[PDB]
Amino acid sequence: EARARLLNTQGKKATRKIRERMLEESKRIAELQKRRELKQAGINVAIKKPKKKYGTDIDYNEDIVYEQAPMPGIYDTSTEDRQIKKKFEQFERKVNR
Amino acid sequence: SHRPQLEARSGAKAAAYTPTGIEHARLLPGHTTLKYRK
């Protein structure tokens, strides 16, 4: 009894969270292989964006969260951006296949 | 989840906000004029 008691430090709330979060992950996995088996039928069903809570709620994926233009500068990068775009279009364009 | 604060809320985070327009109580005009020393 005691040897079992010492080994859990949290309290009811934290454990409750452990559960809730795992349940979220089961939800994810399920919804995925939903979409996977629908792709094996070829019909492509888009994933939901989980709504909002507070009316102003942010969807982080969509736009740069708070975009700080890095600086001015003397050294005129301006070329490295093209190596970037080449690599980024390159990467994402890969993953699609 | 009780955490000792390490900080305080910068006035700035407030400062950007737009106003309200609510009128509270203690702001009703009183002692409407000052007094000066000789």
């Binding site: - | 305080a8 910068s10 006035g11 702001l27 002692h31 004029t33 000052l34 007094k35 000066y36 020393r37």
Partner: protein
């Protein structure tokens, strides 16, 4: 650079006079956290305290005039109007409570800080309070209608002292992120920073004439001129820290309180530090409780007022014997900065 060092063996500063202990006034039961004295008649302290009272002592006699109580939490700060018969005292409950002396009663509660308020000062010629504190913003309270007309933005930390000055830059303020901003109110924003201090800037003071601001630090006490925001001098200060307070004077004596219990007086022009004193802590105190929490100089220039964490006020006197006779202090050996 050696030229710079030869010059510093020339000017050979400005004999000033020693100091000593005239009077000890007990009678607070807390720490004594602020002092400010009449702009006019020099009869009376006003003494903050950590039991939340404010007692008004009597300068000459040392007896107790009165008690202005009426705060919840401790009073950090006091300022006294020149032109008005007011007293703005501010504590940590997030409140600037105007006073009126004529009847010895409260009048206006100014209001609006997110959190406790560590400094008041009274804009000298415009009829405006300036306040600020752990919110890290420096508010200009308009006096009569209690609107926080201007909210000055600012630092990254608690704001330890605000100084108001009559002409441009009008508010001068220093923050435990280790800078001193210099503010231009009408435009609405910082007109300069003076960055040098390597830690919090825990006091300032205004040359009663020359129009400059001594800026303390923890361990090494610089000065600054306004307009350009020069560096000017560096008062030769080993690490004696920590610096609780700055007090300039009419004779350009300078005070600075230590928390190790050491008063450090300077010449102003030089940096020559010409007296240091252990402040004999007290009867039953605990050696940590020797410190100095506040200072000011009366309007004559000749008499010193400081509180001490051991629950008492001390008043120091300028000892006239002095001259050269055997006066001299540490005898001017500018060293390698």
């Amino acid at each position: 650079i050696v030229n710079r060092y030869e010059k510093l063996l020339s000017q050979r500063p400005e004999w000033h006079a020693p100091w000593k202990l005239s009077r000890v006034i007990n009678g607070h039961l807390g720490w004594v956290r602020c002092v400010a004295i009449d702009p006019v008649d020099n009869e009376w302290f006003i003494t903050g305290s950590n039991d939340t009272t404010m007692k008004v002592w009597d300068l000459a006699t040392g007896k107790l005039k009165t008690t202005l109580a009426g705060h919840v939490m401790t009073v950090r700060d006091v300022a006294v109007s020149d032109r008005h018969p007011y007293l703005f005292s501010v504590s940590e409950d997030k409140t600037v409570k105007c006073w009126d002396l004529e009847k010895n009663q409260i009048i206006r509660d100014y209001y609006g800080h997110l959190s406790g308020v560590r400094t008041v000062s009274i804009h000298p010629t415009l009829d405006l309070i300036a306040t600020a504190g752990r919110d890290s913003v420096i508010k200009l309270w308009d006096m009569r209608t209690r609107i926080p007309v201007i909210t000055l933005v600012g630092h990254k930390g608690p704001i330890n002292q605000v100084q108001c000055t009559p002409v441009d830059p009008q508010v001068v303020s220093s923050s435990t992120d280790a800078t001193v901003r210099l503010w231009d109110v009408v435009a609405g924003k910082t007109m300069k920073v003076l960055t040098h201090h390597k830690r919090s800037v825990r006091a300032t003071a205004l040359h009663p004439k020359e129009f400059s601001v001594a800026s303390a630090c923890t361990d090494d006490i610089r000065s600054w001129g306004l307009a350009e925001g020069s560096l000017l001098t560096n008062f030769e200060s080993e690490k004696t820290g920590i610096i609780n307070t700055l007090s300039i004077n009419q004779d350009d004596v300078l005070f600075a309180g230590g928390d190790n219990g050491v008063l450090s007086f300077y010449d102003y022009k030089s940096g020559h530090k010409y007296q240091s004193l252990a402040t004999r802590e007290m009867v039953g105190s605990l050696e940590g409780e020797r410190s100095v929490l506040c200072s000011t100089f009366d309007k004559t220039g000749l008499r010193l007022i400081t509180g001490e964490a051991d629950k008492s006020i001390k008043i120091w006197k300028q000892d006239e014997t002095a001259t050269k006779e055997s006066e001299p202090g540490l005898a001017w050996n500018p060293n390698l900065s």
